[PDB]
Amino acid sequence: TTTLAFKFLHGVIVAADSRATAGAYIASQTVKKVIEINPYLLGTMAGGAADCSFWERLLARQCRIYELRNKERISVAAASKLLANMVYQYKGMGLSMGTMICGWDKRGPGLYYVDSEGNRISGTAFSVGSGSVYAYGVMDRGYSYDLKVEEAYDLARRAIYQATYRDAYSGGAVNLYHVREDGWIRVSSDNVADLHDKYS
Amino acid sequence: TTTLAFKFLHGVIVAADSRATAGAYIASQTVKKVIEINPYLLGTMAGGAADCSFWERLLARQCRIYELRNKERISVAAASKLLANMVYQYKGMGLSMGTMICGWDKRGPGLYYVDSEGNRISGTAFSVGSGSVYAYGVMDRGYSYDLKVEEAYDLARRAIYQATYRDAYSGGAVNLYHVREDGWIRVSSDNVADLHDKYS
Amino acid sequence: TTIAGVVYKDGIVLGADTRATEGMVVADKNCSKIHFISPNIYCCGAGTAADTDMTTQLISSNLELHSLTTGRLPRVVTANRMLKQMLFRYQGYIGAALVLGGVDVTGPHLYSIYPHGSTDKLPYVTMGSGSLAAMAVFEDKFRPDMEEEEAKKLVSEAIAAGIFNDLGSGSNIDLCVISKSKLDFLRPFSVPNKKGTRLGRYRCEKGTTAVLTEKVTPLE
Amino acid sequence: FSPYAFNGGTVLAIAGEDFSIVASDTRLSEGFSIHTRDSPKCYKLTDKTVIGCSGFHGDCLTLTKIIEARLKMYKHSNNKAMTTGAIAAMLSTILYSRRFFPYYVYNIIGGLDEEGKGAVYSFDPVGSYQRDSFKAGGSASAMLQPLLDNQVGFKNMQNVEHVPLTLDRAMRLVKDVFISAAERDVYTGDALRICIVTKEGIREETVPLRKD
Amino acid sequence: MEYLIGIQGPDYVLVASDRVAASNIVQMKDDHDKMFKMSEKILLLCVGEAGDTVQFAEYIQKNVQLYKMRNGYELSPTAAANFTRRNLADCLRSRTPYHVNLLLAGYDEHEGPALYYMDYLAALAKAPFAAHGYGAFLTLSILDRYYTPTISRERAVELLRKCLEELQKRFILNLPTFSVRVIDKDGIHNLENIAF
Amino acid sequence: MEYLIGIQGPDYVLVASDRVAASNIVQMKDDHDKMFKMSEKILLLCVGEAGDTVQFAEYIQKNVQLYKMRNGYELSPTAAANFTRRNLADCLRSRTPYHVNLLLAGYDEHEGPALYYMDYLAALAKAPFAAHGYGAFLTLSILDRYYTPTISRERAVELLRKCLEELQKRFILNLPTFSVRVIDKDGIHNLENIAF
Amino acid sequence: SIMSYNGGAVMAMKGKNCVAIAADRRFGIQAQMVTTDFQKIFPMGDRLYIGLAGLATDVQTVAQRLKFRLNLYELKEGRQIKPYTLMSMVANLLYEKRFGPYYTEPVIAGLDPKTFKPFICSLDLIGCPMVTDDFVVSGTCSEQMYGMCESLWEPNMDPEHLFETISQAMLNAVDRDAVSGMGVIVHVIEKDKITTRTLKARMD
Amino acid sequence: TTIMAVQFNGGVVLGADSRTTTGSYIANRVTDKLTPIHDHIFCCRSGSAADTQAVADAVTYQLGFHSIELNEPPLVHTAASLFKEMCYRYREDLMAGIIIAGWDPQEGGQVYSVPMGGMMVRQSFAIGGSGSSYIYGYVDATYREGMTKDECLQFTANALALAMERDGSSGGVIRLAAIQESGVERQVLLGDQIPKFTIATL
Amino acid sequence: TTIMAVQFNGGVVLGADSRTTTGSYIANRVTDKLTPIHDHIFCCRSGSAADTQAVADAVTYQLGFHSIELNEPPLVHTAASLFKEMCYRYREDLMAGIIIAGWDPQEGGQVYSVPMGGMMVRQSFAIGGSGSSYIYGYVDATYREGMTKDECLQFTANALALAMERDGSSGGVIRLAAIQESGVERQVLLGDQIPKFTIATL
Amino acid sequence: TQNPMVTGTSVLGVKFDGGVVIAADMLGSYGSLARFRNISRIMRVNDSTMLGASGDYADFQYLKQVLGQMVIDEELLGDGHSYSPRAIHSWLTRAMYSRRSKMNPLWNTMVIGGYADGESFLGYVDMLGVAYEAPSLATGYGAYLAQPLLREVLEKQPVLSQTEARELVERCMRVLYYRDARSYNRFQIATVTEKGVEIEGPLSAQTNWDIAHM
C-alpha cells in the first residue's frame, strides 16, 4: 500500500494505490484506500484492511452525529483527534492502521496523519504504506506550494506510479482526489499499466 | 573507563582514567590503561581488562620481532593493522577490546582506533570507553589544531575529569601522555579529587 | 503415499499409489513408487522421495556389484542388511520408509524398513500416509498362502483404501508380482480415478498475447 | 490446546447481469483424513442472497447460525427482508466484533441487488470486504482466481470481443475450474454444489468430482 | 530519539527541543513542537512513546488549567511538578503506564526560576540544567564545563548553541532545527529557532 | 547505516558514498573512505559489518592486483565482478560468512562502463543505476524518475545531488559528506566532495 | 521463507514436436525490486534449456556449477548431453548438499539430440526428479501456475498454439503474485529454430 | 515392551511380548524380541527397536569371531560384557535395556541384566521394558528358589500376561524360550493359551 | 504414596503407607493417610498433601451438615459424589487422587475411586498413589471374590508391603482400617509385622 | 479441561435399515496403562437417542449428567414434545463450541445415534465444535482403521440390515484390537430402533494369531 497527500495553494491532493495482499498472493487489484467521511472530509487507509475500514467508518459516524448536535461541520483537527483518542484505548493490542485525514475547515486546507501507534501530526506532505518511502522521493523532488492544479495531479500520479514500480505490495490503479473549498472531487483513476506506457 | 587521544600540531595527547569495575563494586582505582608498546608507540585499553592487556602485549611482542627482522621500527599504520588482523580471527567469540594506537612514524603523528568488532580507522580525535560520550563533548568544544602544548594538556585533562564526573564507571586519577618526534613522555598523573578543587 | 505388500502362496505382491504431493498440492499425478533393486527383488518407497530414490539406487547398485562378484542370485537378507545398516548410520536423517520384497533361493521374503534402521519380516506390510487404511484391509481379508489372483485383489483393495481415505494418496494403483519364475510389473494395474471432461474450450488463439521483443535463431 | 482447525473447502462466486452463482465443493476434511464427502458450504440466506463459508468448520456453523438469527431480527424490527448490500455490511461488523479471537472463515456473499443485478461481496476473516465481479475463497482460491481473471475479465488478452457473461456460459466455467481444482488441490473433491441466484428464486445443482 | 534541554539562570530558565517527528527511517515532520504550555509561566517539555507523550502532556495541561479556573491563581512550578510526578507514578504499576521523559520549566514570583527533571519511572529532581534523550550524553559534559549559576541570558543562549553544535558533529541522528523558549517574570517568550 | 550509489552513463560510471564511520551513537569519523581501488579502471564500494567489509574488500583487491602482476593485463569489470561474487558465495555456507553489501564500478575498453550490484547473499546483478543501505529506499525512485541512458556527465552529477539532497531532508540518519568519483576511458577521477 | 526471498517463477510446457520454457524477469530483495532483467533460464545445449527459481544467489551458483560439469562431460565423450541425462546430473548435484542444500528448484526443457522428442521435468531442492508429459512449474506462484496450466494445456499443440498457452499461463499467474513479474521471457524450442520473445506484462 | 528372564538348575527361561508400537498404533503385533547371540546365549530386547537390533548384531558378530579364535563355547558372562561395553560407550545415543541369558559349561544357567545406563548386574531373574513396572510386586511375591524348568515357564508366562493386560505398549503373543545344555526350546503362547485372570466385577 | 481399599460382605478394608516426602527427604514418616469423613465413611489420600487435606475437610463439613438436615446416616455414594464434584470443578488446581470407602445400610460396603481428573467409578477394590504401579499385576493375580474380612486385611497388607519395598515415595508403617455395620477397626502394622518377601540372591 | 486424564478410545457408529448401531470398548486409559477396564462409554439419552464418547472420561460423565437432567426436565412437563436426536446433536455442538471459545474445552469426541419419525440419525461432535452427519462414523483411531472398512461397505451397499450392520461393526472392533494400542478386547454394542435403545455386552471379538508362527 501507498497513500500520499499534500496540501498546496489550491487545497489538498490525495492519491493512493488499489492493491490488497494476503502474504505473497495478490488478493485484489481494485481495493478502495480512500474513505469519503463526508462532503468536505477524506480519510486514507494503510496497514490493516479491516482495522482501517472499521475505525474510519466509526469516525464517519461520530462526525455525522457531531454535525447534528452542534449544527455545524467538524474541523479536520477535531476529526483527527477523535480518531486518535479512539485507537489509543487499544494501544498495544495489535491494531494496525495508518491514516491521513484531509479536509477544508475554518483554518483552510488541513492535513493530519494519524496511526495506531499514537501519532497525530499535522503537515503539508505525508506518505503512508510500504511504498511510502519511494513516494516521498518523487513527491519532495517536484513538490512546490505554488504548483498549478494540473501540475499537482501529475506530481501525485507520478509519485504513486514510481512507488508501485519499486514496492512489491503496491500496484493496481492510481485513484486521485482533490480537496477544495467546495468539497472533495474524484479527479481520476488510471491503471498503473496505462501510466507505464505514458511515462515511457 | 574513559580514554581519549587527539593529535594536534605538536604530536599526540593521550589521557585516560584508572578505574576498574567488577559489576557495581570498584575493584581498583589505580589501574594502568595505557600500554607502552615501545619508545615511540602507545596503546590505550578499554573494555575487557584481560583482553586488552593480553592482545596489546602480544602486539608489543610482534612489534619487537618486526624491528629485529627489518632493522627498523614499525609504523603506526602497520602496528594497528597487526592488531586488527589478530583479533579478527576470534570475531564473534566474545572478545571485548577498544584500543587507540598512537605514535610517530615517517608520516608524522599517527592515531588509529582499533576494536574487537573489526573497526580500524585513523583520525585526529578519538574517545573510547563508557565515559567516552562525555569526553567527546568537552574535547570537541575546546579542540584546536594550533593548540599550544600547555593548552593541549589542560584540554585532555579537563575532558577526562568531566567524564569521570558523569560516568559511574570512570574515576581515579588522570594519567596523561604526550607523543613527540623523540618519543612519548609521561606528562602527569593527577587524582580526580585534586582536579575537582582546581576546577571549582 | 500408500505402499503395501503381501506374501502369497508362491511369491510376493507389491503395490502403491501414484500420486506425489508437495505440501497440500498435487505435484505429480503419475509417480512411480515401486523401485527395482534386482531382477528378483523390488522395493516400495514412502517418506522423503529424494531419500528413498537415492537410497534404493545405491543399494541396488551395490547388490548388482555383489551379484557380479559371487555370480549368484541376490538374497533379500542382503538387501535388508545393506539398507538397515545404512539407515541406522544416518540416525534417521535419511527419511526412507521402504517395503522390501523379493524371491530368492530361500523363497519369498517381505521386509519393512523404517528410517531409523529397524526392520520387520512379516507376511504383509503397509507404509506411508495411508498405511492404516491399507492395514485395515489386510487385517480383515488376509489369508495365508493365497493364490496369485487373490493376492493381487487384496493388495489392490489395500492400496485403494488409502487412495480414497487419505488425502496424501491418490491417482492409480501400480502392482508388482514377483515369483520364482517371473516378475510382472503392472503399471498401472488400475485407474480408479478419472479427471472430468472439460465443458468448454479456452484454446488461446494466435495473436492473443502481446509481444514486446522477439528473436529467431536457426539451428542445424 | 489449539481452538482452530483447517477443514479445507473452496467457495466460488460469480456475478452476472441478472443472476449470481455461488459454488463450492462438499468435502470436509481434517489433517489427512476425510470427515464426510457430503458437506455443502453454501447457505441460503434470503430468497436472493446466498453465502459461502470455508475455513474452520466449527466457526462456519456458528457464524451461519448468527447470521440467520440476525436476518430474522432485522425483519422483525424493520418489516422487510435484508438486502444483499445490507447483509454484507452487517456481516462486516459481525466479523470485527471478534477482532481479537476472529472467525477462521472465508466468506463470500452472492446475490442480487436492488436493481436485479448480480452482486458479489468477498470477505476477509476480520471483516474487510468489497464488491466484485467474481471471487474465489478457500484452499484452491489461488488456483481458480487467475483463471477467472483471464476467462471472465479478459486480462492479458489483445483482440477479444469482450462478450457479456451469460448464465449458460458461466455454468460451464464454474464446472471447469472446479474440475481443475480437484486435480491439484487435495482438499477439494467429492462433489460440486452450484447455487444459481436469479429473479425467480434460488436453484441448486450438484456435480460429482474426483473422490481421491 | 528526541532531544530536550533546559538551562536555569539567575532569574530566567531557558529551554530547547528538537522539531523532528520521525516514523521508521524518515523524518515525517521538520517543525514539530514538543513544548506544552501549562500556564502563563510554566512550560512542559515531553518526549517518549508515540501516543503516550501527547496523551499524558495534555491530561496534565487540562488539569493545571482547570486549577486556575476554579481557584483564580495558577499552580506554582513546584506544585505543578509534583502534581505531574504523582500522576505519572500512579500509572507506573497500573494497567496503562506512560513511557514519557520530561522537563518542567517555570517561573515563580517568590521562588524564582525552576527546572525539573523527571524520568519515565517518575523520579522528580530539581537541577540547574538538564537534558533528555541520546543527545544528552554528548551535551551534559559541555554544560558541566561552562555553566555558572550567574550565567546571563545572552551567555545562556551562547552555551546552548555549543551543545546543539556538538550534536551536529557527533550525533548519528539528524536533528537540524530546535525550538528555543525562555521563561522569566514577563512570561514565556519565543526565541528564534536555531537551525543548521 | 552506510549509503552507496552508482550511476552508469553512456561512456562513464559515477559512484558516491557517505564518509561517516559511526560507533554506537557517535560519528567517530566524518571523512571515512568506503571506496577501494581494484585496478586502474575498477572501483569497489563496500559497506556492511564492522570488520567484514575491509577484510573482504582488501582480499579481493590483493587478488585483482596479483592477477595483473602475473598476467600483464588487468581483470575486466565483468570478470572482477564474477570473481568477487564467487568468493562471497563460497563463504556464505562456510564457517566465516562475510556480511557485506557492495557495488562494483568499472570501465572496459570494449564493453564500456559497467555497474554491478551485489547483496550480502552474493547475488550479482548488472544495472544502469543502483544504491545500498537504508537511504536507497528514499533515492531509488528519484533515480527512476530522472535517469535516462544517454544522461550526460554533468547531468549525472546534478541527478546525484537531488538524491543526496533528499537524504538531508528525509533520512533520520546524519550523512553530511559524500565521496564522489567517476570512471571513464581515462581512468578514475576524484570529484569534489558533496557536503551540506 | 528462504525460497521466497528473491521471488521468481519458471514454467515448462510440452507441445507436439517442441517445448516451451518461460520465466519472470524480476530480481529483488524482499519487497524491493532491484533489476527487471535477471536471467533465470540458461542454455545447456542447442535444444536443452534449464530454468531456475528460488534464492537468486543459488540460482547463479547452481547454474554455473552445472555448466562446469556439463562442459567436462561433453569434452570427455564428444557428444551432446541427452535431456534425461542432464536431469540425473542435476539431481546428483543437488543431492550432494543433502543437509544444507541449494535453494533452487530447477525445470528442464528440451528435445533429444537424435530424435527430437520433447522432454520436460522438475526437481526439488534435494534433487528429486519428476518427468511429466504436459507441464512443470516452479516458483512462488506455483499454485497459480498449476491452475492456469491445468485448464489451458492441450495435448499435441503446435509451436504457435503452444507459445500462446504458456504465455497466458505465466502472464495470469504472475499477476496474482506480488514478488513475481516485472516481465516474462519465453523460449520456444523447435527442431530447427529457437524463438525467444519478451511479453508485454505489468510492471507493478 | 515387557521382557523377562528366569534361571533354574539346568539353564534359563526367557520370555517377552510381541507388540511394536508407534504412539497408539501397533506397527508389528508379532515381533520376536528374543534374539539368539550364540548357540546357548539369547538376549531380550527393550527400548529402541533400531538401537537394540544394531547392538545385538554387533555383539553377535564379535562373539562369534571370538568363539572361533578361542575354539571354545563362549561364556554367558562374556556376551554380557560385550553388550555392556557397547551400551556404556554409546550411552548417550543408544536407548536399549538388554537382558542377556543363556547357558555355558563353566557357570550353567545365568541371567544378566544390562539396563539403559550400561551397567551389568547378575540376577536370579530379571524384568525389563515399560510393562515391567506393573509386575514388580508379583514377581517379588511369587518367585521362590528351587523352581524347575517347567515351573519357570509357567511363572514367566503368568508375569508377562499380567503386564500385557495392563500395559498399552505390551500385547500380542508370548514368546518363551528354554535354554539348557541340550539346546533351545522355543514356544509361543497364542490367544487362549495366554494365562487369564478374572476382572473384578460388580 | 500407596493407598488401597477392598470390599467384602460386611464392609470394606482400607490401608495405606505413612511416608510424606519432599524430593528425597522424608518430612513425615508416620503420616495418617486414612481420613474419616463420617462414622462409617473413610477416604484414602494421595497426591498433594495440602490439596487432599482441604478437599477432605470441605467434604467432611458438607456431609455432616447434610446428614443432620436429612436426619439419616449418609450414603457412601453421596460422599463420593461430593468428592467428585470438588475434584472435577477444581481439576486444574487440585492434584488429588481420593479413594472413598465405607459402609451404609442401603448398599453395604462400597469402594469408590475418584482419580486425578475428577471422574468417579465404583470398584470391588482400588489402588492409588505413585506406588500403585508396582502392584497392579499382584492385585490382579491374587484377588478373588468371596474374601472374608480377615482375608481382605491380609491381602491389603501384602499388597501395600510389596509396593512400599519398591517405591521410593512409599514406606514407614501400614495403617489398615476395617469398616462394618458395627464401627471402625483401626490397626497399625509396624516393622516386623509388615509382611516380608525374600530377595533373589546368588 | 486442558490436560485429559482418563480417556477412552475410538467409538464406531453405523446406520442401517431402521436404526443406528454404536460400539465402544469398556476401557479407561491413564496414559498408556489400562486403569479402569469395566466402564461404559455409551449412554442412553432417551427412547430414540443414545450417545457414545471418546477422550476424557471425566468430561463425559459431566456431560452425561447434564444431558440426563435435561431429558428429565423435558419429561416432567409431559406436553408431547421430546428432544429428537438432531436436537440433542445441535445442543451438544453449541455446548462444545461455547467451551472452546472460552479456551476451556470439554476434551471429548461424541457420536450421536438416534431414530425418530422413521429416520435414523448419526451425528458427530468433536471438542472444537466441528459437527456433521454421516452414514458411518468413527472417532479417534477408528477414523484411520475402521472408517476405511465401513466406507467400503457403504459404497456397494448403502442400505444395510440390522444383521449386516451388527456383524460389520464386530469386524471393525476386531481390527481395532489388533492395531490400536489404547484399546481393550471387551466392548459394548448399543442399538436404536423403533422399540428404543438397547445396550448389549460386555462382548469380545475373536482374534487370530496365525501370523506369529509365520
UniProtKB/Swiss-Prot annotation, chain D:
Q: Which Gene3D superfamilies match?
A: Glutamine Phosphoribosylpyrophosphate, subunit 1, domain 1
Q: Name one GO biological process term.
A: proteolysis involved in protein catabolic process
Annotated GO CC locations? cytosol; nucleoplasm; proteasome core complex; proteasome core complex, beta-subunit complex
Instruction: Fetch the SUPFAM superfamilies from UniProt.
Output: N-terminal nucleophile aminohydrolases (Ntn hydrolases)
Role description: Non-catalytic component of the 20S core proteasome complex involved in the proteolytic degradation of most intracellular proteins. This complex plays numerous essential roles within the cell by associating with different regulatory particles. Associated with two 19S regulatory particles, forms the 26S proteasome and thus participates in the ATP-dependent degradation of ubiquitinated proteins.
Q: How does it assemble?
A: The 26S proteasome consists of a 20S proteasome core and two 19S regulatory subunits. The 20S proteasome core is a barrel-shaped complex made of 28 subunits that are arranged in four stacked rings. The two outer rings are each formed by seven alpha subunits, and the two inner rings are formed by seven beta subunits. The proteolytic activity is exerted by three beta-subunits PSMB5, PSMB6 and PSMB7. Interacts with SERPINB2. Interacts with RFPL4A.
Query: What is the protein name stated in its UniProt record?
Result: Proteasome subunit beta type-1
From Swiss-Prot, chain G:
Q: Which UniProt keywords apply?
A: Acetylation, Cytoplasm, Nucleus, Proteasome
Q: Does the keyword Metal-binding apply?
A: no
Q: Which Pfam families match?
A: Proteasome (PF00227)
Q: Give the protein's biological function.
A: Non-catalytic component of the 20S core proteasome complex involved in the proteolytic degradation of most intracellular proteins. This complex plays numerous essential roles within the cell by associating with different regulatory particles. Associated with two 19S regulatory particles, forms the 26S proteasome and thus participates in the ATP-dependent degradation of ubiquitinated proteins.
- Could you name the domain of life of the organism this protein comes from? Eukaryota
Its subunit composition reads: The 26S proteasome consists of a 20S proteasome core and two 19S regulatory subunits. The 20S proteasome core is a barrel-shaped complex made of 28 subunits that are arranged in four stacked rings. The two outer rings are each formed by seven alpha subunits, and the two inner rings are formed by seven beta subunits. The proteolytic activity is exerted by three beta-subunits PSMB5, PSMB6 and PSMB7.
A cellular component term, taken from the record's GO annotations: proteasome core complex, beta-subunit complex
For this UniProt entry, the molecular function terms from Gene Ontology, in alphabetical order, are: endopeptidase activity
Its BP terms in the Gene Ontology are: proteasome-mediated ubiquitin-dependent protein catabolic process; protein catabolic process
Q: Which residues carry this modification: N-acetylserine?
A: 1
What family does this belong to?
Belongs to the peptidase T1B family.
Q: Which residues carry this modification: N6-acetyllysine?
A: 76
Recorded protein name is Proteasome subunit beta type-3
Q: Where does this protein reside within or beyond the cell?
A: Cytoplasm; Nucleus
Tissue-by-tissue expression: Detected in liver (at protein level).
Q: Where does the UniProt annotation place the signal sequence?
A: none
Q: What organism is the protein native to?
A: Mus musculus (Mouse)
UniProtKB/Swiss-Prot annotation, chains H, I:
Which residues, renumbered to this chain, carry the PTM Phosphothreonine?
Answer: 35
Keyword terms = Acetylation, Cytoplasm, Hydrolase, Nucleus, Phosphoprotein, Protease, Proteasome, Threonine protease, Zymogen
Catalytic activities: Cleavage of peptide bonds with very broad specificity
State the superkingdom. Answer: Eukaryota
Q: What is its EC number?
A: 3.4.25.1
Please verify whether the record's keywords include Secreted: no
Catalytic center at which residues?
A: 1 (nucleophile)
Is Hydrolase one of the keywords UniProt gives this record? yes
One GO BP: proteolysis involved in protein catabolic process
Q: Where in the cell is it found?
A: Cytoplasm; Nucleus
Q: Name one GO cellular component term.
A: mitochondrion
A Gene Ontology molecular function term for this protein is: threonine-type endopeptidase activity
Induction record: Up-regulated by the antioxidant dithiolethione (D3T) in liver, lung and small intestine (at protein level).
Family label? Belongs to the peptidase T1B family.
The function of this protein is: Component of the 20S core proteasome complex involved in the proteolytic degradation of most intracellular proteins. This complex plays numerous essential roles within the cell by associating with different regulatory particles. Associated with two 19S regulatory particles, forms the 26S proteasome and thus participates in the ATP-dependent degradation of ubiquitinated proteins.
Q: How does it assemble?
A: The 26S proteasome consists of a 20S proteasome core and two 19S regulatory subunits. The 20S proteasome core is a barrel-shaped complex made of 28 subunits that are arranged in four stacked rings. The two outer rings are each formed by seven alpha subunits, and the two inner rings are formed by seven beta subunits. The proteolytic activity is exerted by three beta-subunits PSMB5, PSMB6 and PSMB7.
From Swiss-Prot, chain J:
Q: Which stretches are transmembrane?
A: none
Q: Where in the cell is it found?
A: Cytoplasm; Nucleus
- Write the record's keywords in alphabetical order, separated by commas: Acetylation, Cytoplasm, Nucleus, Phosphoprotein, Proteasome
At which residues is Phosphotyrosine found?
Answer: 57
Please list the tissues where expression of this protein has been recorded.
Detected in liver (at protein level).
The record's GO CC annotations read: ciliary basal body; cytosol; mitochondrion; nucleoplasm; proteasome core complex; proteasome core complex, beta-subunit complex
Signals that turn on the gene: Up-regulated in liver tumor tissues (at protein level).
An example GO BP is: negative regulation of inflammatory response to antigenic stimulus
Q: Name one GO molecular function term.
A: lipopolysaccharide binding
Q: What is its main location?
A: cytoplasm
Purpose:
Non-catalytic component of the 20S core proteasome complex involved in the proteolytic degradation of most intracellular proteins. This complex plays numerous essential roles within the cell by associating with different regulatory particles. Associated with two 19S regulatory particles, forms the 26S proteasome and thus participates in the ATP-dependent degradation of ubiquitinated proteins.
What family classification does the UniProt entry report for this protein? Belongs to the peptidase T1B family.
Q: What is this protein called?
A: Proteasome subunit beta type-4
Q: Which gene encodes it?
A: Psmb4
